[PDB]
Write a protein that binds this ligand. Structure first.
Ligand SMILES: Nc1ncnc2c1ncn2[C@@H]1O[C@H](COP(=O)(O)OP(=O)(O)NP(=O)(O)O)[C@@H](O)[C@H]1O
Length: 240
């Protein structure tokens, strides 16, 4: 119902990607226009990249730049539910999404479903495939998923008509880094010498994971010494 609060303006970097998702955005705003023209869209987009680059953020950003709903689910939860239930819910997810088109359905950790872990997995994988093939030419709704290793994902998830469009996403740029830091740093008493702008400027190649431990780690070094604030030194030290 309520579109996200994130747009391509709040996503540092990923230029090459944002462009590719332009087409998807155009279709979620005017699904009738793309209908009239006799044009088709992939309807299955797998964002490819390493853990901690903000793939879900960009995904959520697509639903927001088109002011359309961002319906989410966890591929992992499904596989964790009694055999049959995980599938039942995949059935639900899409039956609800049909009722809120146009929209984006983000299946988180699609690797939980596509990668040979299992009765649950297989019943959840099968139900997802049918659901994605259960789409009509007039079905405004694009399914997005995220993964790091597309190679070992059941080939069926990638057959035309399903997740037949992939977009690579590299580690964040100095800004994407400054952002992740500023976030996690929330609730962490920093000293006056902490230059998060500079911290980001010197951790190239870092992913949201590396940038989250550095703070946590720098949090302990200071806690253990019983200091009330993380300083730029703790930060430099935590980095390695
Ligand atoms: N490129 C970026 N620009 C601005 N903020 C970002 C960026 N990448 C990540 N973030 C921030 O990190 C938070 C996590 O975003 P999310 O999409 O859930 O990424 P993730 O959980 O780190 N990793 P992934 O498994 O690759 O999706 C968001 O609240 C963002 O503010």
């Amino acid at each position: 119902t309520e579109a996200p609060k994130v747009t391509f303006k709040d996503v540092a970097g990923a230029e090459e990607a944002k462009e590719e998702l332009k087409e998807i955005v155009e279709f979620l705003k005017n699904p009738s226009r793309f209908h009239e023209m006799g044009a088709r869209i992939p309807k299955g987009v797998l964002l490819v990249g390493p853990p901690g680059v903000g793939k879900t953020h960009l995904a959520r950003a697509v639903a927001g730049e088109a002011r359309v709903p961002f319906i989410t689910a966890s591929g992992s939860d499904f596989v964790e539910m009694f055999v049959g239930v995980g599938a039942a819910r995949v059935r639900d997810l899409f039956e609800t999404a049909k009722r809120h088109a146009p929209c984006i359905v983000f299946i988180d950790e699609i690797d939980a479903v596509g990668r040979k872990r299992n009765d649950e997995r297989e019943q959840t994988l099968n139900q997802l495939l049918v659901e994605m093939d259960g789409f009509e030419k007039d079905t405004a709704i694009v399914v997005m998923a995220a993964t790091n290793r597309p190679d070992i994902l059941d080939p069926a998830l990638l057959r035309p008509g399903r997740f037949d469009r992939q977009i690579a996403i590299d580690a964040p740029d100095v800004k994407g880094r400054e952002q992740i830091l500023r976030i996690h740093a929330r609730g962490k008493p920093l000293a006056e010498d902490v230059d998060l702008a500079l911290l980001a400027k010197r951790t190239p190649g870092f992913v949201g994971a590396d940038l989250e431990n550095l703070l946590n780690e720098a949090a302990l070094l200071a806690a253990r010494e019983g200091r009330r604030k993380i300083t730029m030194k703790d930060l430099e030290e935590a980095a390695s």
